[PDB]
């Protein structure tokens, strides 16, 4: 669910997930996909594409189990879709952290930014 | 859409919508419904529940007509869903203004992972 995702993002990046990634570039947020503005943006693109391959489970609503032992995300989840969902979320949280150095506040928005096309996941 | 909603919030509350309500508490902004921290947060909770009843229109992208007449939001749209969407937005805007007195800037960018689970709508 969104709870696990946001928590993962916070754990990996240390940043407020809503503030930094709720509306950033063409892909980080709740407005679908677009041509990535930067590395951070690309993480969210891949993440949304990761969500599409999911079969059955609700990425937004369905909770899953994961461990943060030794400050590492471990999806211990028992369900194929939920295990896959967890790995999607872990991947983006990791990717966002890895690309903190090129994170640019300029790509934050209040309303839909001018985005070129995203290709088919 | 977010444009009309933001304009309504600005008109009712007189506060910059994104800054004041783009990530307030557990319910205002991107992250889905969590247990409301206060009255303001509760408006957003009700708002998100209001959105869930919408049939065939997208609350994020879909434009709609409304007027501001004698400092009153008046929804216009002939389309039933867009009208209903407009009423959701009007209601939260009014609700937010009504609870300005207990607005908490400490919630303005609340860490949503700190939020408790929300009741079903």
Residues A91/A2, Cβ–Cβ less than 8 Å: no
Q: What is the tally of structural domains in chain A?
A: 1
Could you tell me where the beta strands, DSSP code E, fall in chain B?
Answer: 66-69, 72-75
Check residue B103 and give left, alpha or beta (phi > 0: left; psi -120 to 50: alpha). Answer: beta
Q: How far apart are CA A96 and CA A12, in angstroms?
A: 8
Residue of B nearest to A30 (CA): B30
Is-catalytic flag, A89? yes
Interface size, chain A vs chain B, as Cβ–Cβ contacts under 8 Å = 51
Resolution in A: 2.1
Which residue among B3, B30, B32 sits closest to A23, beta carbon to beta carbon? B30
Q: Which tokens sit at A94?
A: 């990791």
Q: Which tokens sit at A69?
A: 């032992």
Hunting for tokens 């007027």 — which residue is that?
A: B67
By CB neighbour count within 10 A (0-12 exposed, 13-18 middle, 19+ buried), where does B101 fall?
Answer: exposed
Spatial CA neighbour of A41 closest among A24, A18, A20: A24
Residue A50 sits at the vertex; the CA angle it makes with A49 and A53, to the nearest 5 degrees, is 90
Experiment type: X-ray
- Domain limits at A89? 1-121
Show which of residues 12-31 on chain A sit within 8 Å of chain B, judged by CB atoms: 16-19, 22-23, 29-31
**DSSP β-ladder status, B72-75 and B66-69:** antiparallel
Q: In chain B, how many H helices and how many E strands?
A: 4, 2
Residues B73/B11, Cβ–Cβ less than 8 Å: yes
Domain of residue B23, CATH code: 1.20.90.10
Is-catalytic flag, A47? yes
**DSSP β-ladder status, A74-75 and A66-67:** antiparallel
């Amino acid at each position: 669910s969104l709870f696990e995702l946001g928590k993962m993002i916070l754990q990996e990046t240390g940043k407020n997930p809503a503030k930094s990634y709720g509306a950033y570039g063409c892909n980080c947020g709740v407005l679908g996909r677009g041509k990535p503005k930067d590395a951070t943006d690309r993480c969210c693109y891949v993440h949304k594409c990761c969500y599409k391959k999911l079969t059955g489970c609700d990425q937004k609503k369905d909770r899953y189990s994961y461990s943060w032992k030794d400050k590492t995300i471990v999806c211990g989840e028992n369900n194929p879709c939920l295990k896959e969902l967890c790995e999607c979320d872990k991947a983006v949280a990791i990717c966002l952290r890895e690309n903190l150095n090129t994170y640019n506040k300029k790509y934050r928005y209040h309303l839909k930014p001018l985005c070129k096309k995203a290709d088919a996941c």
